[PDB]
Design a protein around this ligand. Structure first.
Ligand SMILES: [K+]
Ligand SMILES: [K+]
Ligand SMILES: [K+]
Ligand SMILES: [K+]
Ligand SMILES: [K+]
Ligand SMILES: [K+]
Ligand SMILES: [Mg+2]
Ligand SMILES: [Mg+2]
Ligand SMILES: [Mg+2]
Ligand SMILES: [Mg+2]
Ligand SMILES: [Mg+2]
Ligand SMILES: [Mg+2]
Ligand SMILES: [Mg+2]
Ligand SMILES: [Mg+2]
Ligand SMILES: [Mg+2]
Ligand SMILES: [Mg+2]
Ligand SMILES: [Mg+2]
Ligand SMILES: [Mg+2]
Ligand SMILES: [Mg+2]
Ligand SMILES: [Mg+2]
Ligand SMILES: [Mg+2]
Ligand SMILES: [Mg+2]
Ligand SMILES: [Mg+2]
Ligand SMILES: [Mg+2]
Ligand SMILES: [Mg+2]
Ligand SMILES: [Mg+2]
Ligand SMILES: [Mg+2]
Ligand SMILES: [Mg+2]
Ligand SMILES: [Mg+2]
Ligand SMILES: [Mg+2]
Lengths: 238, 244, 124, 97, 77
RNA sequence: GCUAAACCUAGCCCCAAACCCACUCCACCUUACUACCAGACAACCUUAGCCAAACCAUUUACCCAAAUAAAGUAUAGGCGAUA
RNA sequence: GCUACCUAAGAACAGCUAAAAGAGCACACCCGUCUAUGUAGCAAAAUAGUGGGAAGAUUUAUAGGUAGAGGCGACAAACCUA
RNA sequence: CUCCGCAUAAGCCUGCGUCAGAUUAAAAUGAACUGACAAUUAACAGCCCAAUAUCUACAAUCAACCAACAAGUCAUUAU
RNA sequence: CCUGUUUACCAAAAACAUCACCUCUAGCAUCACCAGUAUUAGAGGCACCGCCUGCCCAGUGACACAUGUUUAACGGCCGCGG
RNA sequence: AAUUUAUUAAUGCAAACAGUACCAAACCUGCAUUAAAAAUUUCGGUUGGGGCGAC
């Protein structure tokens, strides 16, 4: 079919971009995921998940000022508009973030730990043990791919040979380098899991279609299954 | 009604008229030739007669080749006459079991060879058989120059041949311009495959590539009639003067 | 229920179809921004009409005329009438060479001309 | 290299005719795949000294993977052809004299 | 990090050249003389074409750095 | 007495022979028959099944390059049907 | 080009109550509960009356997409040109 | 009587204008059938745009109080 | 439970969906899920709320594999005489 | 229910490949194994109708 993806823009901007829905269909045009269709129209706001992204003419630790914390219809968390130097960008807001705060983005790993403030971005080897974190990355410069959802938070367990042991929201441990940047604190909208849809129509506004009426018989996959926490996932090559 | 000629002869009737009739002779002979390829995916009997064990009589035996399907990606490499075998099988080799579709594919590798006549390295896709055939010919140049077309089974292998034969006929000095002695030594090893340039420039070309070539050799703006009539005039005036 | 055996015309189809289809009239310009059409004076055919004053010929010819036979004109017929006389004269004079063929009337090329013969760039 | 064989017999065609193939003549049975047979060595002549053999013009039956991958590209070893043996035979002859 | 623009929306890589252009001393037979594409002939390589005359409706401005009024020191307007 | 009835041409069929194969101008792969602008998509790949076997499951004739004859012979085949 | 679901960009919803509403009364509009009529008919599924909904999971025009070993489906073995 | 009506879009393509008629409607004046002749005139509408880089956080709802979520249809500059 | 949905052309319903509750799976990026990241997404069951959801892992299945684990998994949850 | 694993996935061996007595990432190909999801075909007779029972 003549399907073209809307994710064509090649330059970053804070302007809300118009995106088109899929309906659970792939480029072939056939349904590949059920339960997706319709919903209120939405404009996408690019999010910069690389906190430490010095400007073209600048290098080293920099600071940004929070301008506005607003609602995002493309994610469960809230986004914040920060401005440093001559540029502006969207980021994931933390639990306690207001218009007027000044956040820090640094890559310096000092001999000693640093007093951790919420919203600040430091490497994993520059934070004390037991510190809550969010938006971690697998390797340096990869970009934050974890702990992005509302209220989610990790914790730093220990540091070993330039490697940090991270505990994910699924109570699973992940091992990465100490040069990977993470943000301190929890993610915004802590009470998102306590929302009540109330009526079926409100799920049709979110782009969710009703389940199939066909009756299925359960198999052996069903039923409680007490299995042990899987081993630690390591992105460090030795 | 009926056709004057059978349908299987229509393709050779197109080579008698038109621009194809104006093609070289040696090229046209190489097309109608249907020499048998070398067996790859089956063993030949080796003899013409055998003694059937059941009755003990001298029966005749014939070698029937197995159809081989050559994918288009085989014309960009050197598979050595190998290809896919599109056939059937019996489950558990039992005739009374049901019959299934089976495809046997060859194992391909991406190697790098060097040609001495061309002084250039190519990254071709090959099979284990091609590597053995290059070791029996003692180089890639002999393999490309000895092996015929029906055994090469590659358009790229036939274009290399044309490239090599053109340098053996033109005696191209571009090969090692700064090493005359070395160059001469290379052409003295492949002197048994030398073919005149006139005949070595049509090697490997298909019927569609040759027609386009011959068309370009005949393409020329028509001569104006102003010049033709002047020649007739001047030539005619001279004859008139003699009679006077 | 559609007539697939009827001539497709600009009168058929929705608004976008009826405006894009024409009738065979050649264009004399282009559309600019704002749907503003720009007319090119050089694209409009200029009629070259001659003066018909004191012209003897008339639409018809009197029947009191001979039944001359038809001799279609050929290239060889045109060469001998116009080009040959000049060549014969120079041949007798003793000064004739191919280099001067352009002087006799021959055209080596058609470029740099207003009315080229092939491919012709003028109207009947 | 996959080598196969037909289950059913093919009737003789004659002298100068092509056989008549049927739908049953597409059924094959795997006879042998040459990629599972014992490997063989590669007879080569050494143009330069090598860790395995430091004598020039010496015959070595190395594995196919060793000669094709390293020796032949580098030019350390040349193909042990009837003509190459003669060239190196002369050098050996000079040493004897 | 995360790059913007999916490869499916980007311009597809040009088709790989035929292997006849890798063999020295050999002229490829293309469909340039036929004035139209055919699958059984090599794809020719045309040289960069220039209109040769000015046409406002089809004008292409020169690169930025070539503009006369170009300064390294930026001016915030 | 109405309605009707009646007809012999049009051409067609099977062979033989011979290989076959265009044109005034203009328009036509975009919504064909649409005068006029930046492109690069490209072709190849075992026919299956009905049916027969009184089911069906291996199997079941399909011009393939000379008429005849060798011969429905050798041979193949749930060694059955049949080939 | 019917229909099922989806995509893009559009359109429509009086008046009253409450003004919060997948809220109520009730036009347009959508549906088709019960009854009679009709049964080669006005109609290869209609007519009259009576009814359900009518700011929402609403209705609807336009262009496009998913094709039969399949698609689509708030599963009726529905619907995919009577 | 008024179930409407006028117009636009879509679709259709000369399909109740004149003359004539043996054709036609239940109807030998009429006519949607036949033959000939005539006819719809752009301002509405359709048919658009030089290049490169760059800009575009702050709904709508009389948009002002006010209150929301399902978070929204409209903008540039430089050469 | 509710508004809602279905057998266009004999069934509009107690059938389907549904807010809620629960089980299972997944530690991740450049064409769907998603330009998303376990307070997420997907596969399913039941059916708002309120009081509750009891016993059984022998068998089948699934998971883990060395025993073993698991029923809001398929399913099951006595009898004779006085 | 009988037949089958072509297809898909996993695993193993082979093939291919390297390095300092030990041993080589995956992709691809071939041969096996196990699942998944499917495919082809059938569902006998007698019978005071058939089914059940019986034969
Ligand atoms: K039957
Ligand atoms: K009409
Ligand atoms: K309906
Ligand atoms: K109802
Ligand atoms: K169990
Ligand atoms: K009876
Ligand atoms: Mg949100
Ligand atoms: Mg979303
Ligand atoms: Mg559900
Ligand atoms: Mg259900
Ligand atoms: Mg049968
Ligand atoms: Mg419609
Ligand atoms: Mg939409
Ligand atoms: Mg209202
Ligand atoms: Mg309501
Ligand atoms: Mg109501
Ligand atoms: Mg529906
Ligand atoms: Mg049902
Ligand atoms: Mg049923
Ligand atoms: Mg206008
Ligand atoms: Mg209630
Ligand atoms: Mg019904
Ligand atoms: Mg009903
Ligand atoms: Mg229910
Ligand atoms: Mg229970
Ligand atoms: Mg008792
Ligand atoms: Mg039986
Ligand atoms: Mg019976
Ligand atoms: Mg009975
Ligand atoms: Mg019984």
């Amino acid at each position: 079919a003549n399907f073209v993806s809307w994710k064509s823009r090649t330059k970053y901007t804070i302007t809300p971009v118009k995106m088109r829905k899929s309906g659970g269909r792939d480029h072939t045009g056939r349904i590949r995921v059920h339960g997706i269709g319709g919903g209120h129209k939405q404009r996408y706001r690019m999010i910069d998940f690389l906190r430490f992204r010095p400007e073209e003419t600048k290098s080293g630790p920099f600071e940004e000022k929070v301008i506005q914390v607003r609602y995002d219809p493309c994610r469960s968390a809230d986004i914040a508009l920060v401005a440093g130097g001559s540029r502006k960008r969207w980021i994931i807001a933390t639990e306690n973030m207001q218009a007027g705060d000044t956040i820090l983005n640094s890559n310096h790993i000092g001999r000693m730990a640093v007093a951790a403030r919420e919203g600040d971005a430091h490497p994993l080897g520059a934070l004390p043990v037991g510190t809550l974190i969010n938006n971690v990355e697998s390797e340096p410069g990869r970009g934050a791919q974890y702990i992005r959802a509302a209220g989610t938070c990790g914790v730093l367990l220990r540091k070993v040979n330039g490697t940090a042991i991270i505990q994910l929201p699924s109570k699973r441990q992940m091992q990465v380098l100490e040069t990977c940047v993470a943000t301190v604190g929890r993610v915004s909208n802590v009470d998102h899991n306590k929302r009540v849809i109330g009526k079926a129509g409100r799920n049709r506004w979110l782009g969710k279609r009703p389940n199939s009426g066909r009756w299925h018989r359960k198999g052996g996959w069903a039923g409680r299954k007490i299995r042990p926490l899987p081993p630690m996932k390591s992105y460090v090559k030795l | 009604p009926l056709h004057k000629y059978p349908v299987w002869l229509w393709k050779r009737l197109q080579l008698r008229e038109g621009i194809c009739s104006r093609l070289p002779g040696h090229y046209l002979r190489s097309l109608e030739e249907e020499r048998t390829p070398t067996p790859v995916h089956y063993r030949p009997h080796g003899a013409k007669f055998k003694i059937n064990p059941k009755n003990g009589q001298r029966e005749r035996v014939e070698d029937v080749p197995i159809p081989i399907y050559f994918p288009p990606e085989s014309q960009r490499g050197l598979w050595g006459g190998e290809g896919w075998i599109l056939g059937q099988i019996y489950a558990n080799n039992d005739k009374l079991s049901k019959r299934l579709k089976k495809v046997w594919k060859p194992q391909l590798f991406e190697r790098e060879f060097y040609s001495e006549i061309l002084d250039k390295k190519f990254t071709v896709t090959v099979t284990m058989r091609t590597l053995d055939l290059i070791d029996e010919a003692y180089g890639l140049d002999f393999y490309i120059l000895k092996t015929p077309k029906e055994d090469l089974c590659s358009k790229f292998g036939m274009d290399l041949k044309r490239g090599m034969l053109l340098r053996l006929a033109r005696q191209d000095p571009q090969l090692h311009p700064e090493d005359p002695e070395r160059r001469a030594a290379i052409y003295d090893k492949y002197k048994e495959f030398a073919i005149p340039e006139e005949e070595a420039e049509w090697v490997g070309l298909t019927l569609e590539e040759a027609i386009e070539k011959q068309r370009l050799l005949e393409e020329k703006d028509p001569v104006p009639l102003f010049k033709i009539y002047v020649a007739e005039l001047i030539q005619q005036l001279q004859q008139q003067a003699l009679s006077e | 229920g559609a007539d697939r055996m009827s001539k497709w015309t600009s009168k058929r189809g929705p608004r976008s179809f009826r405006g894009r289809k024409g009738r065979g009239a050649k264009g004399i310009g282009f559309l600019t921004s704002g749907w503003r059409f720009v007319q090119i004076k050089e694209m409009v055919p200029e009629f070259v009409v001659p003066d018909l004053t004191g012209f003897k010929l008339k639409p018809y010819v009197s029947y009191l005329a001979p039944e001359s036979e038809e001799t279609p004109l050929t290239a060889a017929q045109l060469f001998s009438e116009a080009v040959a006389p000049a060549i014969e004269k120079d041949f007798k004079d003793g000064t004739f060479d191919p280099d001067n063929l352009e002087k006799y009337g021959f055209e080596p090329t058609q470029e740099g001309k207003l009315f080229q013969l092939y491919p012709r760039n003028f109207l009947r | 290299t996959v080598i196969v064989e037909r289950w059913w017999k093919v009737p003789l065609a004659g002298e100068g005719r092509k056989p008549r193939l049927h739908r049953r003549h597409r059924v094959y049975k795997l006879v042998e795949d040459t990629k599972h047979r014992p490997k063989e060595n590669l007879e080569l002549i050494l143009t330069q000294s090598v860790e395995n053999v430091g004598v020039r013009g010496d015959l070595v039956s190395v594995k196919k993977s060793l000669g094709r991958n390293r020796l032949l590209p580098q030019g350390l070893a040349v193909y042990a052809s009837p003509e190459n043996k003669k060239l190196f035979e002369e050098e050996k002859l000079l040493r004897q004299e | 990090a995360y790059e913007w623009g999916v490869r499916s929306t980007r311009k597809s890589e040009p088709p790989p050249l035929d292997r006849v252009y890798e063999i020295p001393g050999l002229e490829p037979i293309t469909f340039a003389g036929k004035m139209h594409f055919v699958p059984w002939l090599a794809r020719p390589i045309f040289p960069p074409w220039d209109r040769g005359y000015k046409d406002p409706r089809f004008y292409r401005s020169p690169p930025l750095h070539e503009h006369p009024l170009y300064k390294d020191q930026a001016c915030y307007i």
